[PDB]
Amino acid sequence: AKLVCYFTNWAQYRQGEARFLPKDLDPSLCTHLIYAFAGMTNHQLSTTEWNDETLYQEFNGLKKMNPKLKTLLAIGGWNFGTQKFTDMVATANNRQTFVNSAIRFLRKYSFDGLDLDWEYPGSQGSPAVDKERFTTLVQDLANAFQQEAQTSGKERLLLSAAVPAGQTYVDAGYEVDKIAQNLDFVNLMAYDFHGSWEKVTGHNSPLYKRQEESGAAASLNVDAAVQQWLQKGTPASKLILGMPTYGRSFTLASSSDTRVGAPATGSGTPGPFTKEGGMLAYYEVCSWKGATKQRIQDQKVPYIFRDNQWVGFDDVESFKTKVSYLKQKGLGGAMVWALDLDDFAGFSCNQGRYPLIQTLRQELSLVPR
Numbered sequence: 001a002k003l004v005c006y007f008t009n010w011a012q013y014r015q016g017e018a019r020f021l022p023k024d025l026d027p028s029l030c031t032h033l034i035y036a037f038a039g040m041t042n043h044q045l046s047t048t049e050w051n052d053e054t055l056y057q058e059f060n061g062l063k064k065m066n067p068k069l070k071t072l073l074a075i076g077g078w079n080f081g082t083q084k085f086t087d088m089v090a091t092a093n094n095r096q097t098f099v100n101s102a103i104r105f106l107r108k109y110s111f112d113g114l115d116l117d118w119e120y121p122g123s124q125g126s127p128a129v130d131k132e133r134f135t136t137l138v139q140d141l142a143n144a145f146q147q148e149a150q151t152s153g154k155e156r157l158l159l160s161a162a163v164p165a166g167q168t169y170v171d172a173g174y175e176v177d178k179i180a181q182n183l184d185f186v187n188l189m190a191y192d193f194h195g196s197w198e199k200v201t202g203h204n205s206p207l208y209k210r211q212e213e214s215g216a217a218a219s220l221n222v223d224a225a226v227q228q229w230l231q232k233g234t235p236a237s238k239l240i241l242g243m244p245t246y247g248r249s250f251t252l253a254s255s256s257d258t259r260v261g262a263p264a265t266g267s268g269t270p271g272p273f274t275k276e277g278g279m280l281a282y283y284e285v286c287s288w289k290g291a292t293k294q295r296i297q298d299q300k301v302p303y304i305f306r307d308n309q310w311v312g313f314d315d316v317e318s319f320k321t322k323v324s325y326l327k328q329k330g331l332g333g334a335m336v337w338a339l340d341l342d343d344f345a346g347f348s349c350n351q352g353r354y355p356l357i358q359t360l361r362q363e364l365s366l367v368p369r
């Protein structure tokens, strides 16, 4: 089993106990640690924060403490957009520039692989031609990593990708059967199914549909997303089930209607540390005072409300349920977005350090013995 965990290079800017620093990294928590994010400059892999090189040293330095650990560098992410990917994959020349730069960069900074986080080929401004061009990029990288291993004698660089759960994005961008052959593993972003972009409450990451749902909505759940990727050709062993250590929040139209599917007027109030309306870290919801926690019976996940605020999130129990699910489906492991949104320092939830991610590790039978 794998436990793939994302580090984010902006968590260092949060205030107080929420500030995530190198000391908070645990070398034996996860099997694979992925650094979010690198960017691109003139079609070449590049850093995005002023101190990334310092953090790379710390991050990859964890392997001294745990030599089994593998690290990857993720390129892209939501905020990065699509244009630079589009321009880079447009020509064989630009792809070659990128691929060669990636190999040199990963070797220079001691990463074990690259995680592709283009959000997304064929959508968010990216043209339809990018679906096949993404397939080619994945192939170019896989083949070049294979060649570098042969020439250098070093262990081959890993290639993974973070991929969307919704059919609209999947079909616009991803030749699933083709790319799955060339990726070492596939990080399924089984979250952000619902959020304050909608005008009714819905859960960030429900396991199953609700009985009331129909149409496309009935596929906006973890089980449907997993089945989608499997049926379209991803080997179960390569599919890694993403898990969110955050929730998505709403302002309710009325404090008297707190159901799933109740009218909402917009994003929930920003959290005191994360300061982003519409999301909350686990450590910002786990210890809500004077609130009412509820479970969505069909969907196997909790929500919580207080006055006109409503949040769908994941807890220890829902993580257990989801690991039982992934094991039943024979998947390759779990992925987590993100280290810094769990109660990494044990300051809030009275559950010790990393209560959610330690649950994944335990349920996957990955505890260091």
Ligand SMILES: CC(=O)N[C@@H]1[C@@H](O)[C@H](O[C@@H]2O[C@H](CO)[C@@H](O)[C@H](O)[C@H]2NC(C)=O)[C@@H](CO)O[C@H]1O
Residues within 6 Å of the ligand: 006, 076, 077, 078, 079, 080, 117, 119, 162, 189, 192, 246, 276, 279, 337, 338
């Ligand atoms: C691997 C992965 O899930 N990548 C995406 C993430 O970028 C995204 O997290 C969001 O990243 C933005 C930067 O690109 C941040 O500004 C933003 O705050 C952050 N949002 C959260 C909840 O962490 C995650 C999560 O939505 O999913 C992908 O879209």
